Design a protein around this nucleic acid. Structure first.
Lengths: 71, 239, 216, 190, 133
RNA sequence: GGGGCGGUAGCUCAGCCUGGGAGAGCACCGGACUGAAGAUCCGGGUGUCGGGGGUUCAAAUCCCCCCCGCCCCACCA
RNA sequence: CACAGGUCCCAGCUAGCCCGAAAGGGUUUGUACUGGGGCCGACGCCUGCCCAGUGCCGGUAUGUGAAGCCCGGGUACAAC
RNA sequence: GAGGCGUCGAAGCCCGGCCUCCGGGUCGGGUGGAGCCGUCCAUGAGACACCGCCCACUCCCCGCUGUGUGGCUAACCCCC
């Protein structure tokens, strides 16, 4: 294919879980790609993911979030 | 086909449909031959009378150039009140001045429509016009119907309201008392209905009680066929 | 043009004149507006060829295909005679090296050969009239050879509302070319369409000669 | 509709009568003379202290256009929801003071001012403060040129004067000029 | 054009953030010339999709390209929403637009609250128990 | 008879002037989606697109002759 | 049958409606608490629902719609 | 009609105004400073070789003539 542009981002921290399914887990990301660099986003990721993994972000401009929490 | 109708008779000026003019009282004149500008003119309420055909009270006024003419009486007038005519007339009730000279937002009657034609507007019992806005170009006055007409600022008018209010507040009571009023005025009566009038007499309605063709009539309809609800935009009281 | 105005009427002779300051030889042009012509039928367009009395003054390239006695008629006149076989060579090879396309002006054939013209040449040459075509006369060995050598000029009508038939190129005298212009004009008027002002304008004009209106 | 753009015309804001012609503001419009009474929002950059900071949003009307240059006078001030919601407080009061000004020049101006009470004790001292604001403003306007007068009304200068005299009466905090609307143009003689 | 001294243009963008559709509209500073009006509906094929962040961003992006053509590159953003016939708080399109502007490359000026809030009471729909679910 | 408009995939039509093998949504079959159903997406095709004939390599709309409905007129010895 | 009461409708007066071959005229020494036209027919309680059809009213891009003028054609002009 | 163009001053660099399908052409400044094109062939139909007249939308100074809107006041009309 054409790229689009692939924005590679790695996951800085795994905040907690979202979905009534549960199926997204919400994770905080940092970017490492040619354009922006450094931008912190809270993306909704699915499936087994650990800390320090790599995600290709299809759309830079995103960041839906919902928050709480552990006592 | 049928005879001329009830309205078509009226137009002839035949005498059953002729206003009396010999039991009836004066008309309003303000007189513009002594002009508004360079005024000279005050007068004294000589007497107050009832005018039969206006169904309102009217004033005789004795001017100080020596002419006697009627002016339609304001509320709260005394016999021996002084009425002034001009722009340099005081700004008070019963005083007559041009619209421009009259404040905005004050009640006014007896407004001219062409300067110096003596009052052709607001000359009925208890009803009054409001000066909503004034501009040197044109002064807009709000009429008894709720509806705004633009008049020249150099029209005359009198400050206050007409007298003889409550006029339709009191009822007419009976067919007798009413008969008495219509003689005082002119209004063809007793007036019956077309519905049990024969096909000759009237366009709608036959021998018995029921309408012929629809009551609602054109705006291009003929003379002698323009009876009912004339050019009705709506009718009824419902959606 | 500084030379002449382009609304002034002239004679057929007078209009063809010379004034070029240029390298390029004077190519001569006849351009005509016709009123009252439509594509409301496409067919009713003027299309013919007319044999000029004194020709273009450029050499025709005629290839004639013929067989029978009709071959004998071509051969006498000084034509080569070339076979129908050549049609298969034109069409089949789409190459770029010595291809025979855009290298000749007309073809004449006898009527049985016409189907073969249609398929094979039609793809490359199309109706740029380098093949013989039924609607103008360029089929038949006998008359068209004689006329074609005498340097016939090609005419067709772009429906709306104009027809053009430039006579040739300058190598001929002004009077000679004046005869050319008359013959073409008479054919044009000769196609007969109703309505006043049928020949709206006629002009005679050139590379850098007088560009002028003429009376038509 | 369907422009090249070449039917669009440009004009450029020059906005004095508070200051010298301000270059800021630019006007595209379509057809000539369709801006003539239209209104341009500027924050004002003239003073990069309080005008910029605390006086976010002031409204100006192009009165006239000459040669496709826009000359503009002061139409208005208003403040955002942000300012008003911030400064108001509970168990105290919020106070609003109207005056309809006449200046000697023959312009009429309307000022609403917002003053915020110091804590405890709600009393007739409040209406007294409203009274004082109206009284000083009348006198000042009468003294001053209306072009000076509006410059001062927008600026903290008015806010600062109201405060000295009112603190004496019953201490306040956070006094401000909520909005200004130009009540009547014309002139002293029509 | 009549000489421009600054060589930057500014356009005041009004953003109407509803819970039924999102609109992104940009006008010059004076406001009297509308360049762009693109609403959420035009991106999508369905009403449910009509508001939402994604609709709001593209509705903003389509308008943005036209602002570049004129030469507008500064934008103020004025966020409003229906305050006098529905509750005043902005919908998805507030958060979504500021991101659209950033991504598009337009420079973002003031972000503002110019939402209608009445200073007076009025009756809306709903009574007896108020509006029942 | 004159003038104009619409007749197109099962359906309703879109593309006249703005030209091509060409269309869209809805019915209908299949796949996503929810505990369920529905709605809402994603596939599938059904007309060279009213007949017949002509210009164009290629025309639904262009051209010559038209069926049918529709609307306004004119007209019936 | 009138009738008091109720309702619908129209008109800013250089009006609306109506009479008159015309000039002109009635209402009108009248001006919306007017004055003109219909319906119903004292009071008491009421007066649901429908604009599909008829009627009236407001409006009408589009199609359409005369004579006139215009342009084209015709006629040496004209009819057409 | 396969040659026109080029001190009858050319490429090819650097911008300016430009419409637009931003497909890409057009064009004034200037550096320059001596070449550029198709015949060739593909393309259903050939030349951004050149020369004529056109058929596209479209825009404009001027000459004639309609129509719409507003201002004016000298006809005419309603008031004194």
């Amino acid at each position: 294919m054409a790229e689009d542009e692939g924005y590679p981002a790695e996951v800085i921290e795994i905040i907690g879980r979202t979905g009534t399914t549960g199926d997204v887990t919400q994770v905080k990301v940092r970017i490492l790609e040619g354009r922006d660099k450094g931008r912190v986003i809270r993306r909704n990721v699915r499936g087994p993911v650990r800390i320090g993994d790599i995600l290709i972000l299809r759309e830079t401009e995103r960041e839906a979030r919902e928050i709480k929490s552990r006592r | 086909m049928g005879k001329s109708l009830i309205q078509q008779r009226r137009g002839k000026g035949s005498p059953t449909f002729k206003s009396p003019s010999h039991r009836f009282r004066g008309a309003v004149k303000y007189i513009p031959l002594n002009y508004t500008q360079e005024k000279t003119l005050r007068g004294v309420v000589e007497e107050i009378m009832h005018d039969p055909g206006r169904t309102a009270p009217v004033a005789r006024v004795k001017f100080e150039n020596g002419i006697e003419k009627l002016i339609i009486a304001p509320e709260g007038l005394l016999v021996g009140q002084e009425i002034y005519i001009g722009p340099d007339a005081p700004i008070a009730v019963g005083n007559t001045l041009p619209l421009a000279k009259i404040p905005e937002g004050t009640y006014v009657y007896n407004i001219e429509g062409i300067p110096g034609d003596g009052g052709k507007y607001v000359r009925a019992g208890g009803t009054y016009a409001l000066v909503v806005s004034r501009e040197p170009d044109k002064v807009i006055v709000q009429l008894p119907s709720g509806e705004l007409k633009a008049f020249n600022p150099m029209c005359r008018a009198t400050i206050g309201v007409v007298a003889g209010g409550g006029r339709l507040e009191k009822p007419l009571v009976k067919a007798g008392k009413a008969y008495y009023k219509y003689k005082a005025r002119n209004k063809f009566w007793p007036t019956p209905r077309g519905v049990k009038m024969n096909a000759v007499n009237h366009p709608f309605g036959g021998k018995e009680h029921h309408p012929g063709k629809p009551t609602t009539t054109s705006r291009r309809a003929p003379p002698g066929r323009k009876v009912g609800h004339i050019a009705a935009r709506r009718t009824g009281r419902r959606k | 043009m500084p030379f002449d105005r382009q609304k002034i009427v002239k004679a057929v002779k007078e209009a063809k004149a010379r004034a070029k300051p240029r390298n390029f030889t004077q190519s001569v042009e006849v351009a005509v507006n016709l009123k009252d012509i439509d594509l409301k039928r496409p067919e009713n367009r003027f299309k013919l060829e007319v044999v000029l009395p004194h020709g273009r003054g450029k050499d025709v390239k005629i290839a004639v295909i013929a067989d029978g006695a009709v071959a004998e008629a071509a051969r006498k006149l000084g034509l080569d005679v070339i076979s129908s076989a050549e049609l298969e060579e034109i069409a089949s090879s789409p190459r770029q090296a010595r291809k025979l396309a855009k290298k000749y002006d007309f073809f004449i054939a006898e009527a049985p050969l016409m189907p073969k013209i249609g398929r094979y040449l039609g793809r490359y040459l199309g109706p740029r009239n380098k093949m013989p075509v039924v609607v103008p006369p360029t089929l038949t060995d006998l008359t068209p050879i004689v006329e074609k050598l005498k340097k016939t000029v090609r005419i067709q009508l772009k429906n709306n509302p104009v027809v053009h038939a430039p006579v040739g190129t300058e190598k001929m005298s002004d009077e000679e070319i004046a005869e050319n212009i008359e013959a073409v004009l008479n054919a044009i008027i000769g196609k007969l369409e109703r309505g006043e002002s049928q020949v709206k304008s006629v002009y005679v004009k050139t590379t850098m000669g007088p560009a002028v209106k003429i009376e038509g | 509709t369907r422009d090249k753009w070449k039917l669009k015309q440009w004009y450029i804001i020059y906005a004095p009568d508070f200051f010298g012609g301000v270059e800021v503001g630019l006007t595209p419009a379509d057809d000539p003379e369709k801006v003539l009474n239209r209104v341009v929002e500027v924050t004002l950059k003239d003073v990069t202290g309080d005008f910029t900071k605390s006086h976010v949003k002031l409204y100006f009307q192009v009165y006239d256009v000459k040669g496709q240059n826009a000359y503009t006078k002061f139409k208005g001030m208003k403040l955002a929801r942000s300012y008003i919601r911030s400064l108001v407080r509970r168990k105290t009061t919020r106070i609003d003071g109207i005056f309809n000004i006449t200046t000697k020049d023959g312009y009429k101006l309307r000022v609403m001012a917002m003053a915020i009470a110091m804590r405890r004790i709600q009393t007739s001292q409040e209406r007294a403060i409203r009274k004082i604001m109206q009284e000083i403003i009348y006198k000042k306007a009468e003294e001053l040129n209306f072009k000076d007068f509006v410059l001062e009304s927008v600026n903290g200068k008015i806010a600062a004067e109201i405060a000295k005299e009112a603190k004496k009466i019953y201490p306040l905090r956070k006094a401000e000029i909520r909005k200004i609307k130009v009540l009547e143009e014309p002139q002293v003689i029509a | 054009q009549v000489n421009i001294k600054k060589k930057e243009k500014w356009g005041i963008a009004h953003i109407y953030s509803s819970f039924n559709n999102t609109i992104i509209h940009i006008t010059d500073i004076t406001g009297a010339e509308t360049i762009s009006r693109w609403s959420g509906g035009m991106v999508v094929k369905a009403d449910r999709d009509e508001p939402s962040p994604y609709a709001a961003m593209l509705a903003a992006r389509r308008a943005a390209e036209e602002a570049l053509e004129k030469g507008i590159v500064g934008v103020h953003i004025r966020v409003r929403a229906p305050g006098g016939s529905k509750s005043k708080t902005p919908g998805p399109g507030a958060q979504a637009a500021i991101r659209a502007l950033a991504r598009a490359g337009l420079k973002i000026g003031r972000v503002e609250d110019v939402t209608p809030i009445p200073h007076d009471g009025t009756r809306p729909k709903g009574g007896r128990r108020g509006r029942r679910v």
